Amino acid sequence: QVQLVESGGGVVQPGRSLRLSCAASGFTFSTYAMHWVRQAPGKGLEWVAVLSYDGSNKYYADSVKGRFTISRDNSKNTLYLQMNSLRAEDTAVYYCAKGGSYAYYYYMDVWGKGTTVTVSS
Amino acid sequence: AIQMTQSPSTLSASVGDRVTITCRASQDINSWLAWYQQKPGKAPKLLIYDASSLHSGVPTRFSGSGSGTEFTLTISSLQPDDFASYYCQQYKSYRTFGRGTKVEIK
Amino acid sequence: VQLVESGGGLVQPGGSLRLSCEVSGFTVTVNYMTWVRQAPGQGLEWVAMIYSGGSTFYADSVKGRFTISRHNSKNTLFLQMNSLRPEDTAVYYCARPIVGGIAGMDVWGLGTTVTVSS
Amino acid sequence: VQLVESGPGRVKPSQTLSLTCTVSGDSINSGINYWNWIRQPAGKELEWIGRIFTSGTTHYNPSLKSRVTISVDRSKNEFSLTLNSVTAADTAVYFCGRGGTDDYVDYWGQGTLVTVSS
Amino acid sequence: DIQLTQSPSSLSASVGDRVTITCQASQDISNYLNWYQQKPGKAPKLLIYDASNLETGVPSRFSGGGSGTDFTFTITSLQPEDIATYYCQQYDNLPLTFGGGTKVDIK
Amino acid sequence: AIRMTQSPSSLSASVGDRITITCQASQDINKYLNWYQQKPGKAPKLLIYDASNLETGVPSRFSGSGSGTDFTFTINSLQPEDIATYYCQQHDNIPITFGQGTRLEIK
Amino acid sequence: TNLCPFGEVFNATRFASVYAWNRKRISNCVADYSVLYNSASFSTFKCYGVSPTKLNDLCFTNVYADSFVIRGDEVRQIAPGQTGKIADYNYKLPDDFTGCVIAWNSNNLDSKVGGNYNYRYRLFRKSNLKPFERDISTEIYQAGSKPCNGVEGFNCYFPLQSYGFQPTNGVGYQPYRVVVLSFELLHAPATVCG
Amino acid sequence: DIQMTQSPSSLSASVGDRVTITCRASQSISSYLNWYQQKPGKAPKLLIYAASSLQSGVPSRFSGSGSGTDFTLTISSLQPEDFATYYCQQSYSTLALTFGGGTKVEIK
Amino acid sequence: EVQLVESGGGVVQPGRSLRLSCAASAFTFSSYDMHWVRQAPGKGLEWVAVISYDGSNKYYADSVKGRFTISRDNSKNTLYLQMNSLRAEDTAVYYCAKDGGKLWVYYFDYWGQGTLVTVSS
């Protein structure tokens, strides 16, 4: 039973930083690529970032490139997203998606429930 | 080179009929055939490639079939927009076109 | 471009010698680089090769004894030779071989003399 | 992808016909694109002149291999066709086009009429 | 980036009618298109993968088709549980871009 | 390994004559053969790549031909500066092997 | 459960290039595993981690068919723990790969008299590919300090090189179509049973 | 193929000694290693499969361990009927099964 | 208790044909894959071929591919190996081995006494 549970969302003032942690279960997390996707309130789905199985190769979206950082801990079976310099446009629901086999970033077979991030004062 | 013989030279049909145009290769070309449609005075439009694959945006009434030395372009229900010239081009060795088939109003 | 070999000389049989190849005009870490030796009075003989990604290939007569590597900080090619034998006495050239038939890519070094004798 | 043909439409026999295709909306020096020149005589069928890849490699119809030269100006993002030793049989409508493969042409230009007469 | 355009952005049909959505990509993506269904409040659910194949447990009324740049998504017999927003996603290259969305309503 | 048999090992001639060097591969190497020139005590210099393509700055009098197993290296008009050693090398099959060598002398 | 579309993967008229290899996902179907190896056309059938005779009695969650065309002499590089140009810059299989590699000679289709330039491989790359990573960028390769500015010159090379495929080439230089079936069995219920 | 190399190629030990035989693969073979025993003039007998599982009917003194490219066969207490040739085989490439060179255990 | 008995060996001239047989007893022959494995005189073991439990799939080693043919008869509980165009390297003792069946990979668990084939003239 593959499960992906996000946590760490909350109210954060603009310009601060937040950390979202996605815990994986039911599969060998240490060998699969991982995606972070987000959806803004009332808008469509926006892909944020992807990370390889060993964590060496990281890819981001232009709206977040140079602003977010995606990492993983295979010993803890977790996927972390560090969000620095938060704008009002980052308020959204974040999901972590299971990727392809080793370095296949083009699959989103299993999605998480998602956590809410509200950037406001 | 590979010579493509296309038949019929001129074809008369009405709107809603079923049109069949045949193309024959001088030597074996496997399934490497393409079908283009061209209006008088305009640039040709790609319809079929790989002798069976529909080009994106082409109406589904066009079908391409055959392989080896016999290929066929079939229009199930003819429409006024489909009265044009149809060319078959092989790419087994370089690219060679057929002399074309003109579909006129009966 | 300029390739300069160094680190040769004379060594006792069974010794280890590190040949260096200083490079100007292109980056070592992102190029195919070969080491080719020529025995005195004999013909050329390919010894080692390294790819753009770092994959290394060696001749059968030198496999397990020679090791080709690169250094980005000094932009130098390196060839470490262990368990040297009298037949290894030769002149060694570091070259940037032509890959994919791209003209103007091939360039050889001056060569360094290695003498393995007692 | 938008392709526009330009060039003198009243070239003389035994001269060199030159045509230029300007590409807008897509780059000519990136991606896998096969920039094709295809000609059609009046009342006849299409004839494929040739193609050039984004790496500069060209491919020609064997009947016109000796008289056709296709080049790419990456500064202006255009590609040009030169046909020398032109006779009266080269009067035709010339199209340029883009193709993702070396098999067919899926994008076409408006085409320019080139007449050969003395 | 690859641009995905959905048509229509919103449509309404009676129960039992055939609902048709189209997704057009700015470049060739072969057969690398997913179709997702999202109800308000829940995470997106993958209905169609590879532009024609149905995910496990998906009812046979949902179907997909197309290859290249034009793709079609079809609900043959609309049901009250099929009222949701339908997205098309490409995975030919990074970034993985979704479509604009399509809200389905009941007449 | 692919054994290259370059013959003859010495074809001493005079200035202005034609030179023909033949190289034979034990296996099939397609067209991937490089002809190198080496002056006495100097580094080898690439003259012909892929068995028929002149290198940058090489005089046009050098030429090559052949594919498969047998290859030919020709000097249209021998010159005093062409007095060197010429090798044939297959480069697309590891291990990379050179030919025997051809010592060009002056008669 | 209907029949798995192995026929589309194996009998496709056009195959992808090795740098842009196709991948098809297969699930929720009945698989004719033991019927895949019924013809004698396969000139290379190598399984790693699974016995081909035990596939019909095995249930998997997913079957991934990666298809492309390479050179004959490069078919040996489609295996775990291989090195070269295809293994490092075009298509890499992991060390603990569990699947089967099936390659066959397609000199009739993928080889044309004038040369078939539709198939290309990445010749230059700053690093080796991670397993199952696809690189399709056509950025000019910079081998020096001077930036290339999108134009190939000295120390600037186009990363993709084409196999000139002709019917006269030797068997080591003739085209070979390669299909790699990777079998994934997670804790999720299996749906690709034989 | 995957070459299997056994160390030592031959060893001498007496009854009651603890014997270890190392098998090395050219590339990683996961845990698919089999240990067989063969007497002179007889047929081979399976001792270990999957590099850790003991075959039924085999004495419990035989054990196997290892992974990746390095595997070990251990006989805790050597006995007169244990003097034979021990082979290691990789089953990772199921259609290219390869045996090792052999390890002849002799009497000191 | 598993019984495997080889037969049909002897001296065969080079390039000729020789058919080896293997009779099986005390186990369900029609439920296990069957291997032929040869050992050269004074050399190590060498896997030759494998056949499936239903006889549909037959696989051969590289040195023997296209030269040997392995078949089985479940009615008689017999395994046949036809060797055509024999070379001097084929002189060896052949054993029919039963597949364990407990793993996704082949592994022999019971071997017959083997029959000798001598390629000489």
Residue count of chain A, please give it.
121
Q: How far apart are CA D84 and CA D102, in angstroms?
A: 24
Provide the phi-psi class of H102: left if phi over 0, else alpha when psi is between -120 and 50, else beta.
Answer: left
Structure tokens at B33: 């055939």
Core vs surface per residue B19-48: b (16+ CB within 10 A) or e: bebbbbbeeebbbbbbbbbbeeeebbbbbb
**Cβ–Cβ < 8 Å for G93, G179:** no
Residue contacts between D and G (CB atoms, under 8 Å): 30
Domains and CATH numbers, chain I: 3-119 (2.60.40.10)
**Cβ–Cβ < 8 Å for H72, H23:** yes
Query: What is the number of other CB atoms lying within 10 angstroms of the CB of residue F62?
Result: 19
Cβ of G122 under 8 Å from any chain C Cβ?
Answer: no
Cα Rg of chain D, angstroms: 13
Provide the domain count of chain A: 1
Structure tokens at C60: 């059968």
Q: How far apart are CA F90 and CA F51, in angstroms?
A: 10
Cα Rg of chain H, angstroms: 13
**Residue C22: closest CA among C110, C118, C117, C116:** C110
Query: What is the number of other CB atoms lying within 10 angstroms of the CB of residue D69?
Result: 16
At F80 the three-state DSSP class reads: helix
**Cβ–Cβ < 8 Å for H24, H8:** no
Provide the domain count of chain H: 1
Residue D21: enclosing H or E segment and its boundaries? strand D17-24
Contacts of G142 in chain C (CB under 8 A): 30
Cα distances from B22 to residues A63, B105, B106, D48, in angstroms, run 53, 19, 20, 21
**E strand intervals along chain F:** 4-7, 19-25, 33-38, 45-49, 53-54, 62-65, 70-75, 85-90, 97-98, 102-103
Q: How far apart are CA F78 and CA F18, in angstroms?
A: 6
Cα distances from D108 to residues A43, B45, D5, D17, G146, in angstroms, run 37, 8, 10, 20, 36
**Cβ–Cβ < 8 Å for B86, B100:** yes
Domains and CATH numbers, chain C: 2-116 (2.60.40.10)
Cα distances from D31 to residues C71, E33, I39, in angstroms, run 32, 21, 56
**Cβ–Cβ < 8 Å for C109, C47:** no
Which neighbouring-strand residues pair with B62? B75
Q: What angle do CA C59, C60, C61 make, to 5 degrees?
A: 90
Cα distances from I22 to residues H42, I5, I63, I86, in angstroms, run 17, 5, 22, 19
I57/G53 CB distance under 8 A: yes
Cβ of H39 under 8 Å from any chain I Cβ?
Answer: no
Question: Could you give phi then psi for residue D88, rounded to 5 degrees?
Answer: -65, -15
I57/G37 CB distance under 8 A: yes
Contacts of G170 in chain F (CB under 8 A): 28, 30, 68
Cα Rg of chain C, angstroms: 14
Q: How far apart are CA A28 and CA G96, in angstroms?
A: 13
Best of F6, F46, F53, F58 to substitute, by most chain C Cβ atoms within 10 angstroms, is F46
Domains and CATH numbers, chain F: 4-103 (2.60.40.10)
Does residue G100 lie within any of the structural domains? Answer: yes
Cα distances from F82 to residues C107, F72, F104, in angstroms, run 19, 17, 8
Does residue G134 lie within any of the structural domains? Answer: yes
Amino acid identity at A48: V
Amino acid identity at B98: G
Query: Using the 8-state DSSP alphabet, how is residue G8 labeled?
Result: H
Question: Could you give phi then psi for residue G76, rounded to 5 degrees?
Answer: -65, -20
Q: Do chains I and B touch (3 or more CB pairs under 8 A)?
A: no
Residue reference for tokens 């099929």: E82
**Cβ–Cβ < 8 Å for D97, B44:** no
Query: Using the 8-state DSSP alphabet, how is residue A29 labeled?
Result: G
Query: Using the 8-state DSSP alphabet, how is residue G87 labeled?
Result: I
Query: Using the 8-state DSSP alphabet, how is residue G75 labeled?
Result: G
Cβ of G155 under 8 Å from any chain C Cβ?
Answer: yes
The burial class, CB within 10 Å (0-12 / 13-18 / 19+), for E53 is: middle
Does residue G192 lie within any of the structural domains? Answer: no
Q: What angle do CA I7, I12, I15 make, to 5 degrees?
A: 125
CATH no. for residue A81?
A: 2.60.40.10
Question: Could you give phi then psi for residue A90, rounded to 5 degrees?
Answer: -90, -5
Best of G4, G15, G28 to substitute, by most chain E Cβ atoms within 10 angstroms, is G28
Cα distances from E72 to residues A45, A75, C24, E45, E58, in angstroms, run 20, 43, 57, 18, 17
**Cβ–Cβ < 8 Å for A22, A96:** yes
Q: How far apart are CA A72 and CA D18, in angstroms?
A: 58
Q: How far apart are CA F5 and CA F14, in angstroms?
A: 25
Q: How far apart are CA I95 and CA I20, in angstroms?
A: 10
Q: How far apart are CA G102 and CA G50, in angstroms?
A: 14
**E strand intervals along H2-99:** 4-7, 10-13, 19-25, 33-38, 45-49, 53-54, 62-67, 70-75, 85-90, 98-99
Closest Cβ–Cβ partner in C60, C98, C104 for F95: C60
Sign of CA dihedral A37, A40, A46, A48: negative
Among the residues of chain C, which ranges form H helices?
Answer: none
Q: How far apart are CA I49 and CA I56, in angstroms?
A: 14
In DSSP notation, I21-84 reads: EEEEESS-GGGS-EEEEEE-TTS-EEEEEEE-TTS--EEE-TTTTTTEEEEEETTTTEEEEEEE
Q: Which domain holds residue G146?
A: 2-184
Which neighbouring-strand residues pair with I60? I49
Q: How far apart are CA G94 and CA G80, in angstroms?
A: 6
I105/G51 CB distance under 8 A: yes
**Cβ–Cβ < 8 Å for D4, D112:** no
In DSSP notation, E38-95 reads: E-TTS--EEEEETTTEEPTT--TTEEEE--SSEEEEEESS--GGG-SEEEEEE-SSSS
Contacts of A57 in chain G (CB under 8 A): 130, 133
Q: How far apart are CA C22 and CA C70, in angstroms?
A: 10
SS3 for chain B is CCCEEEECCEEEECCCCCEEEEEEECCCCCCCEEEEEECCCCCCEEEEECCCEECCCCCCCEEEEEECCEEEEEECCCCHHHCCEEEEEECCCCCEECCCEEEEEC
Residue reference for tokens 């390095």: H70
Does residue G194 lie within any of the structural domains? Answer: no
Best of B48, B56, B62 to substitute, by most chain E Cβ atoms within 10 angstroms, is B56
Query: Using the 8-state DSSP alphabet, how is residue H25 labeled?
Result: E
Query: What is the number of other CB atoms lying within 10 angstroms of the CB of residue C84?
Result: 21
Whether the bond between H8 and the residue before it is cis, its omega within 30 degrees of 0, is yes
Does residue G191 lie within any of the structural domains? Answer: no
Q: How many CA atoms lie within 13 A of I24 on its CB side?
A: 25
Contacting subunits of H (3+ beta carbon pairs below 8 A)? G, I
Closest Cβ–Cβ partner in G117, G138, G160 for D102: G117
Domains and CATH numbers, chain B: 4-105 (2.60.40.10)
How far is it between the farthest Cα atoms of chain B? 37
| C41 to chain G, closest Cα gap in Å | 33
**Cβ–Cβ < 8 Å for D16, D9:** no
Cα Rg of chain F, angstroms: 13
CATH no. for residue G150?
A: 3.30.70.1840
Distance of CA B3 to the CA centre of its chain: 15
A104/G184 CB distance under 8 A: no
Query: Using the 8-state DSSP alphabet, how is residue H46 labeled?
Result: E
Q: How far apart are CA H43 and CA H30, in angstroms?
A: 27
**Residue B99: closest CA among B6, B1, B3:** B6
**Residue C96: closest CA among C21, C38, C7, C40:** C21
**Residue A80: closest CA among A95, A70, A90:** A70
Residue D34: enclosing H or E segment and its boundaries? strand D34-40
Distance of CA G84 to the CA centre of its chain: 14
Q: Which domain holds residue A86?
A: 3-119
Provide the phi-psi class of I28: left if phi over 0, else alpha when psi is between -120 and 50, else beta.
Answer: beta
Residue G48: enclosing H or E segment and its boundaries? strand G44-48
Cβ of G8 under 8 Å from any chain D Cβ?
Answer: no
Q: How many CA atoms lie within 13 A of H98 on its CB side?
A: 19
Cα distances from B78 to residues A26, B36, B82, D87, in angstroms, run 56, 16, 6, 41
**E strand intervals along chain C:** 2-6, 9-11, 17-24, 33-38, 44-50, 56-58, 66-71, 76-81, 90-96, 107-108, 112-116
Which neighbouring-strand residues pair with F32? none
Cβ of I107 under 8 Å from any chain G Cβ?
Answer: no
Q: How far apart are CA I80 and CA D53, in angstroms?
A: 57
E50/G25 CB distance under 8 A: yes
Whether the bond between E95 and the residue before it is cis, its omega within 30 degrees of 0, is yes
Nearest-10 Cα torsion for C68, C70, C75, C81: -30
User: Are β-strands C17-24 and B85-90 bridged in parallel, bridged antiparallel, or unpaired?
Assistant: unpaired
Structure tokens at G8: 């589309």
Contacting subunits of B (3+ beta carbon pairs below 8 A)? D, E, G
Structure tokens at I99: 């597949």
Q: How far apart are CA G86 and CA G102, in angstroms?
A: 16
| D85 to chain B, closest Cα gap in Å | 23
Q: How far apart are CA E30 and CA E91, in angstroms?
A: 10
Closest Cβ–Cβ partner in A2, A54, A104 for G132: A104
**Cβ–Cβ < 8 Å for A49, A33:** no
The burial class, CB within 10 Å (0-12 / 13-18 / 19+), for C100 is: middle
E93/G136 CB distance under 8 A: yes
Residue contacts between E and G (CB atoms, under 8 Å): 14
Which residues touch G180 (CB under 8 Å, ≥6 apart)? G65, G66, G67, G78, G93, G99, G100, G101, G102
Domains and CATH numbers, chain D: 2-114 (2.60.40.10)
Structure tokens at A106: 């083009």
Structure tokens at H9: 């190629």
Q: What angle do CA G2, G5, G7 make, to 5 degrees?
A: 130
**Cβ–Cβ < 8 Å for A32, A53:** yes
Q: What angle do CA H19, H25, H27 make, to 5 degrees?
A: 155
Q: How far apart are CA F36 and CA F106, in angstroms?
A: 19
**Cβ–Cβ < 8 Å for E91, E32:** yes
End-to-end CA distance of chain E: 36
- For residue F67, the chain G residue with the least C-alpha distance is G169
**Residue B31: closest CA among G12, D107, G10, E68:** G12
Best of C50, C96, C102, C107 to substitute, by most chain G Cβ atoms within 10 angstroms, is C102
CATH no. for residue H66?
A: 2.60.40.10
Query: What is the number of other CB atoms lying within 10 angstroms of the CB of residue E97?
Result: 22
Structure tokens at H2: 């995957």
Resolution expressed in Å? 2.9
Q: What share of chain D is helix, strand, coil (3-state, %, to 5)?
A: 5, 45, 50
| E101 to chain A, closest Cα gap in Å | 6
Residue G46: enclosing H or E segment and its boundaries? strand G44-48
Best of D21, D103, D107, D112 to substitute, by most chain B Cβ atoms within 10 angstroms, is D103
H27/G45 CB distance under 8 A: no
**Cβ–Cβ < 8 Å for G152, G162:** no
Q: Do chains E and B touch (3 or more CB pairs under 8 A)?
A: yes
Amino acid identity at C72: N
**Residue F32: closest CA among F2, F62, F77:** F2
Q: How far apart are CA A10 and CA A17, in angstroms?
A: 11
Q: How far apart are CA H44 and CA F92, in angstroms?
A: 44
Residue reference for tokens 């040297």: C84
User: Are β-strands C9-11 and C112-116 bridged in parallel, bridged antiparallel, or unpaired?
Assistant: parallel
User: Are β-strands H4-7 and H19-25 bridged in parallel, bridged antiparallel, or unpaired?
Assistant: antiparallel
**Residue C111: closest CA among C89, C88, C95, C97:** C95
Which neighbouring-strand residues pair with B105? B13
G138/D62 CB distance under 8 A: no
Q: How far apart are CA C48 and CA E101, in angstroms?
A: 57
Q: Do chains D and G touch (3 or more CB pairs under 8 A)?
A: yes
**Cβ–Cβ < 8 Å for G50, G189:** no
**Cβ–Cβ < 8 Å for C52, C31:** yes
Q: How far apart are CA G58 and CA H52, in angstroms?
A: 23
Does residue G189 lie within any of the structural domains? Answer: no
